[PDB]
Amino acid sequence: AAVFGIQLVPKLNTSTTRRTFLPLRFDLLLDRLQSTNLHGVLYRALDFNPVDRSATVIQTYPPLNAWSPHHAFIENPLDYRDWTEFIHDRALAFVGVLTQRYPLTQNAQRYTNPLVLGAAFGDFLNARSIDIFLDRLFYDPTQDSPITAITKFPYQWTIDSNVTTDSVRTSAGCKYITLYGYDPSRPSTPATYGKHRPTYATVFYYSTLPARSRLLANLAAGPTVLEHFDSPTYGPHLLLPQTGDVLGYSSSLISQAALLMVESVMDALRDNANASASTAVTRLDQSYHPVTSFDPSTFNTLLQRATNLALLAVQGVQSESAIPAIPTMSDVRSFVARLMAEGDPQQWFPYRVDQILYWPESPFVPPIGPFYAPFRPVNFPFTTGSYTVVPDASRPLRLLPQYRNATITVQQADDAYEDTALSPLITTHGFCVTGGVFTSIYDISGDPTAYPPAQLVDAPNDYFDRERMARRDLFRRLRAPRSAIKDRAVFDFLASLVNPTTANPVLDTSFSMAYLGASDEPVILADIRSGSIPGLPIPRRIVQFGYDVVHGSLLDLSRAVPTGTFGLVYADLDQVDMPAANRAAIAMLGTALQMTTAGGVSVLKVNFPTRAFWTQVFNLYATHATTLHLVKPTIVNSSEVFLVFGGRQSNGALRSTTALQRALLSLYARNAAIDRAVTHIPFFGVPDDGTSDLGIDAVRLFDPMFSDAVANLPSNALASLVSRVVPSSIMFTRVPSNGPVSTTIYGKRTFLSNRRRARLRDVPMLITTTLVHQRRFTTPPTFTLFSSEAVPVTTLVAAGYNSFISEQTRNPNLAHLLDLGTGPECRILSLIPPTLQVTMSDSRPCAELMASFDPALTAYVQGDYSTAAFWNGIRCDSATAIFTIGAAAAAAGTDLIAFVQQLIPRIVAAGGTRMWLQLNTPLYEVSSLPDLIEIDLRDHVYRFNGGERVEPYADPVPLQQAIAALLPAAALSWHTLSPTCDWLPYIIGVGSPLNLSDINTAISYSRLTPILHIDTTTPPLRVNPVPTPLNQQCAIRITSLDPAAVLSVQHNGVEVIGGTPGNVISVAGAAALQYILANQEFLLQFTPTLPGIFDVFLTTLGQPPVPRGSFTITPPPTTVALNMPPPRQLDFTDVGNDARITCDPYYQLAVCIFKDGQYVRVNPEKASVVTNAPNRDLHFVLDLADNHVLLYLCDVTPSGLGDRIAFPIVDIYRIAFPRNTPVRASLPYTGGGAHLTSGGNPFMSLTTPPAVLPAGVALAALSTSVATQYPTYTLPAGVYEYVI
């Protein structure tokens, strides 16, 4: 429950016993006073500053707390320096006065009288004669402590200790004295409570109860009279606060009378907080109590409100907000603020003037006398128990949402949100992309097919537009920062076009390089000269150019240049309003392809490869160079591609090939994907509205009373909010203002929630227990569209199906769909049109209150589908087993093929037309991922994260025929995460970072686990080769009754073959399509040049395109044979012997060594893949280092090289070095040292150059060393022993 602004945790907890009041003996009082250091023993600096012996306030204990200074001490306060000195003096000098009147030795075993001792000591400090107090400085425990003060003498004159027959009127102590330099201004200084003052109270001690009536009666005019009912300190006192009110705690001056209440009530609360059973406290409660001039009815004055809350604080109730051990003004004020805030004055325990009603069923055990009545309210909501304190959360903690039973009505659960939501919420964007590049090479000179340069995919219209550009730009900045990547990317590739041989060198060691464009000098320059980029030799000299070179002359590549040629003329200038821009580019390339040495390598960078420029380029420079590859390094969303020219020889023939059409086409196909994706993101610096798709919407509540079983606003707003952001995050925080305690509860409202929330018919409640439990302050909210780290390669794949199932389920005729093994909480409800009737099922119970969704539209079945029983009475025309099918085979400990062998037939019986199952079979390759998936071959099984989970798999072919035998008439097809990254509005759409380099990983993780899409509703394909080999003509036959259809097979999310029988444009190879009337099926005579998964599409003139199955041209047989040369005819001389390597032309091989986890391209002079049109050869130069370090021919792809084929050359690794010939001793690698030892004798050292080389040793002509940045000494003849 909650009393006014304060919230009280359910559990009641109070100390269960009271320590018998013990009066200090006379000796102990003598030691306490005469101790080395009084600090701690008598007084205690509340906030003593380490740096300097300074203390703003000092809270004091017993023989000192009684004392109340005279005016001269208040005005001109002392510093913590002379203060310790003042007391360390007076405390001692006082012991004298008192001990000389009572020799300790004889009377130490006599209890001093708490009261008199106080006044007797306080009066001593003020320097008042202390004669009278001594007379009775002791008293026998039997006679009351306050009675001895009266019995000994009824002396009604000594100021500050008027003893009458029944009462002793003395000025309250000063539990706080303030040393000069104190100010209630700072929020940090400890809450003094006005007691730093001398006369803020007037403790009236009384002898008997009738003695007390006579007191109250007489002081009934005074503002109010607080009195401690629970075991008063030295005997029943009767505190009377002076009329004045303290400054600081509330903007509205709080009366000294009411402040004392807060300060105490704030104890009974903080004390209940940690009071335990095992401990025995003085008082079962510390709360004060008003006995006079107090208005019992109203609840305005801070006092009335506080009082009202103390009658409750005596039950053991504890404040949810932890009350500090040493209340500080900032804190006290944050409590006195919470108290003032409009609320409901607790009503369980009515107020009395002489009795505190305490719950019988409560921890609190009444003292004795007549002050505690065991009143029992009709229905107290609190039960007992305590709470262990938990430290403040360092960051906003996310809260999984678990639902309750009652659900709010959309209408009410809306404004509820809109009454406390942070609408125009300012939010940071952060960075959505942080990864490297997603480079993609394309050989234009490679493809042997001519493709009319007039009809390429010309720049898409929309491209240049306020809306599109705005986004293309926005995405750009949303990338945590670029040439360092791009530039390096192009060189990672350029390193493959390097030919070391004399026959026809290309980028041969020490080649000169021209460079245009710099900001200081390009960061890549340092690396080229360092030979840092593996595979590429160190150029002799680099000549910079451009518009801001700062190290070379400034040239304008548009017009002519006055410089000489270069082996490599890497051009990176920008083109930017389209025709003259084309001229700009066509011109630039013209001069860049001019500055290159004859037989060089020009590397221009076009900004808009328009089919307008692709005619001018293939026309003007149709000769200039030999080869040509497009190297689009996608760092951000732009269409600027890089073109590299082979041999800058005058009589070349760079014809536009189908490669270009495909390359160019893939590029755009992705900008539509990347753009459509970015649409879901708000423009920087714009206040958050409801418009933005990815907008972060929160709900800040103030001291919200989340209650179970009640639709109170605070708990009502919680509903909507979580409903508006389910699949997301939902992070709740609690920052403590010196006023109330705000608690925002944001979440990244995406389009994945709008889809889900729409399907909701009602907004369910959330078990507020977890929230009610917190009670600790976390850090302030953040509101940031994106998280900070790039999602796991696994998610890039998962969010690759949530886009796929989304597009499949979006189909109308689909009707009723079920999900075999949806998550514990239906995650598929977001990926389905709010109208389709789906029925998710899972062994575990559904996480979302299935009741809130319309029964007709959403159904939920428990138990597994692996068991035959479950399938009774569940009929859906389409099933989807994504993310489960793999776990079921493992759970049911069964074979993968055998499993689906029993599931598919059940879906057929279940009445299913369509099927989608995230099966995990290696259709592309049996190759695995190092950290993501291990493919144990002894037993068909996977190891996602090697161990984390193990699930059996099937093979592309066996599983393919097994399912075709199950559903013979059904058409099968494999959909897999397409390189176009069109699924993006699911990663960048939900607000998650990523690595443009991982897209490659996931498109490779998607290949390890495709989604076999079956369709009983159509005839399946017919591939004549079956395990279709790349580069072989195959027969494919789509059986469609109407010849008037358009065949359009598309692979990778890009169409490649389209056209009615007569004409068929094919970029995948020679495709001759012709509808045969007889069989009524278009027989496609197709021969592919690219392996993959082609999804055949046969679309009728009218109506949407319809899929008719999917065949898969499998990559060629990866293997490597080398015509290794014989020991003789093979030399260790400079001219490197070369064994012709036999490998499919398809795979590009590159020599390298396996250093660490990756492959590092060996330097071209040591080894290389010199390729003649007739054959690819392995050129190598024998070095003594060859026996220790071995080389590997590796599959060079845009990805890390050498994954498909990484075979190690074990021959060049064993070639035994003779005694009759010179041999080259190089260095093993960039980080390794060596030394030669002929015949077991330290002959020489490669690591350290011998000041003077040994007889017959010199540097080689080349730098054959694998590292390319090391010398390579040639020895005479002998028996050297390389020792790395």
């Binding site: 069923e361 229905n379 107290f380 039960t383």
Partner: protein, 41 residues
């Protein structure tokens, strides 16, 4: 039958409870609530 305490005004294992049918009060609730068209309105 473990003690509860306040959730509900009566403990089951509470002090002096008493099962004891009386032909007089046939236990219960409300099953025959009328809702038919004409009768509900």
């Amino acid at each position: 039958g473990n003690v509860q305490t306040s959730v509900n005004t009566y403990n089951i294992t509470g002090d002096g409870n008493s099962f004891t049918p009386t032909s007089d009060m046939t236990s219960t609730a409300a099953p025959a609530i009328d809702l038919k068209p004409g009768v509900l309105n």
